[PDB]
Amino acid sequence: QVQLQESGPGLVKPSETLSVTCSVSGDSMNNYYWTWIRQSPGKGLEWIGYISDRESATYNPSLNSRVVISRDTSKNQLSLKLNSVTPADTAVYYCATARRGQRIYGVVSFGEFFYYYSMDVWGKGTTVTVS
Amino acid sequence: GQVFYKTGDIIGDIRKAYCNISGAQWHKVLGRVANKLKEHFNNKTIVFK
Amino acid sequence: VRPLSVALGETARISCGRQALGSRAVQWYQHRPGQAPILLIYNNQDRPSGIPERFSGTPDINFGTRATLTISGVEAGDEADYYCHMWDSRSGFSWSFGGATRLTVLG
Numbered sequence: 001q002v003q004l005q006e007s008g009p010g011l012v013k014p015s016e017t018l019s020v021t022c023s024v025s026g027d028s029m030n031n032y033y034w035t036w037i038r039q040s041p042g043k044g045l046e047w048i049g050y051i052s053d054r055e056s057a058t059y060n061p062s063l064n065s066r067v068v069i070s071r072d073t074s075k076n077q078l079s080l081k082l083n084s085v086t087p088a089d090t091a092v093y094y095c096a097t098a099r100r101g102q103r104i105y106g107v108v109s110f111g112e113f114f115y116y117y118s119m120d121v122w123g124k125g126t127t128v129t130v131s
Numbered sequence: 132g133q134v135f136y137k138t139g140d141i142i143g144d145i146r147k148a149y150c151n152i153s154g155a156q157w158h159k160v161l162g163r164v165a166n167k168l169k170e171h172f173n174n175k176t177i178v179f180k
Numbered sequence: 181v182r183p184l185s186v187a188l189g190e191t192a193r194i195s196c197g198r199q200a201l202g203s204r205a206v207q208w209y210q211h212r213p214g215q216a217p218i219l220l221i222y223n224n225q226d227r228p229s230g231i232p233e234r235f236s237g238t239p240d241i242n243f244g245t246r247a248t249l250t251i252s253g254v255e256a257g258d259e260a261d262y263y264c265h266m267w268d269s270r271s272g273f274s275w276s277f278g279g280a281t282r283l284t285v286l287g
């Protein structure tokens with residue numbers, strides 16, 4: 001089963017590198033992708049970077065495209081390298097599941113399919129705040 | 132009285148026109164055509180470009 | 181941010197305000213305040229796991245129909261928010277999660 005456990009420092013000084021990790025237990029390598037979510041400042045769900053299985057970068061433009069995020073799978077961690085932090089993104093980070101689906105409505109050979117994702121299991125999260 | 136008809140926005144999904152050809156039947160017909168052309172062309176190897 | 185929805189356990193059926201364009205792959209969600217939420221449907225039809233069959237979604241046949249979600253027998257989970265994550269071809273990669281439906285109730 002999928003078990004989540006957030007591990008964040010909590011208190012970090014501004015304009016410094018960050019490192020926040022989550023855990024997933026008993027899971028394969030390339031079965032599904034990895035993502036992150038933020039309900040923080042009590043708003044609608046906001047999307048944050050979702051890395052692929054090959055350490056890629058295609059992230060939400062609506063932050064700054066600022067945070068470099070997890071790839072490493074040494075034993076079990078997802079390390080978030082956030083540089084040049086600002087109080088405007090004080091948040092709690094949830095470690096969620098990312099998977100990719102495919103829907104076709106025409107000729108596949110014409111390059112007409114789009115890619116849609118689904119987020120099954122989400123994490124608990126640990127409150128991280130800037131000073 | 133001059134009414135001009137123009138293409139508006141494509142409602143729904145957007146698709147491109149295409150034509151479907153039965154591959155097996157088309158290939159068989161093309162092979163028969165090549166075989167019948169060979170006699171007219173001294174049994175040369177017929178190639179379509 | 182418009183206060184909306186339904187209260188006091190008389191039920192209804194809600195639909196997000198996005199117009200059905202192109203091809204729709206909607207995923208309803210059960211909000212959970214303070215902890216992990218759960219998605220309701222994916223592919224608009226296929227039930228994720230052990231979900232009661234009152235949570236069905238409209239089929240994508242004869243395009244032109246709206247995306248409607250049916251509910252009844254509500255818990256605090258249903259009392260939480262509903263989100264309309266719509267996946268569409270012509271809109272490209274839909275970043276927005278959809279409108280939020282916050283259930284405000286007072287006895």
Ligand SMILES: *[C@@H]1O[C@H](CO)[C@@H](O[C@@H]2O[C@H](CO)[C@@H](O[C@@H]3O[C@H](CO[C@H]4O[C@H](CO[C@H]5O[C@H](CO)[C@@H](O)[C@H](O)[C@@H]5O[C@H]5O[C@H](CO)[C@@H](O)[C@H](O)[C@@H]5O)[C@@H](O)[C@H](O[C@H]5O[C@H](CO)[C@@H](O)[C@H](O)[C@@H]5O)[C@@H]4O)[C@@H](O)[C@H](O[C@H]4O[C@H](CO)[C@@H](O)[C@H](O)[C@@H]4O[C@H]4O[C@H](CO)[C@@H](O)[C@H](O)[C@@H]4O[C@H]4O[C@H](CO)[C@@H](O)[C@H](O)[C@@H]4O)[C@@H]3O)[C@H](O)[C@H]2NC(C)=O)[C@H](O)[C@H]1NC(C)=O
Nearest residue numbers: 102103104105106107108151223224225226239240241242
């Ligand atoms: C010239 O030649 C060309 C050849 O190149 C030819 O191109 C063809 O064009 C037509 C259109 O003109 C194309 O038709 C489309 O085909 C799509 C694909 O169809 C297949 O796949 C779907 C989906 O199946 C996946 O998911 C289900 C459920 O999860 C699984 O059970 C499946 O195993 C499969 O999952 C696999 O794939 C996943 C993704 O990779 C993997 O993750 C997974 O692990 C699996 O590996 C099937 O449903 C289809 O089955 C239907 O057809 C078979 C064979 O006839 C029937 O036996 C069966 O009963 C079904 O009828 C098929 O296998 C279609 O998705 C697409 O249809 C959708 O849209 C139309 C509207 O346009 C709807 O009416 C229709 O219902 C479909 O909507 C469903 O799906 C969406 C999105 O998923 C849902 O949101 C929606 O609610 C709806 O779900 C409901 O209906 C389903 C229908 O059965 C049902 O299964 C659901 O459970 C639910 O009830 C459309 O028809 C075709 O692809 C082109 N072919 C090629 C090769 O390009 C061209 O036409 C020719 N020209 C002329 C003029 O002839």
Ligand SMILES: *[C@@H]1O[C@H](CO)[C@@H](O[C@@H]2O[C@H](CO)[C@@H](O)[C@H](O)[C@H]2NC(C)=O)[C@H](O)[C@H]1NC(C)=O
Nearest residue numbers: 137138139140141142143144145199201270271
């Ligand atoms: C071509 O461009 C014009 C102008 O950008 C588009 O007209 C706009 O259409 C939208 C809705 O389709 C309206 O909300 C705007 O008010 C229109 N603006 C003007 C100036 O007319 C037109 O739709 C475009 N063509 C297509 C096929 O999309």
Ligand SMILES: *[C@@H]1O[C@H](CO)[C@@H](O)[C@H](O)[C@H]1NC(C)=O
Nearest residue numbers: 150151152153154155156157
């Ligand atoms: C074209 O349509 C006919 C009948 O509608 C069908 O028998 C035939 O297989 C179609 N052609 C192809 C290439 O599928």
Ligand SMILES: *[C@@H]1O[C@H](CO)[C@@H](O)[C@H](O)[C@H]1NC(C)=O
Nearest residue numbers: 169170171172173174175176
């Ligand atoms: C072409 O036709 C002639 C006459 O029937 C025949 O002798 C010849 O072998 C044919 N060519 C080939 C390559 O078979």
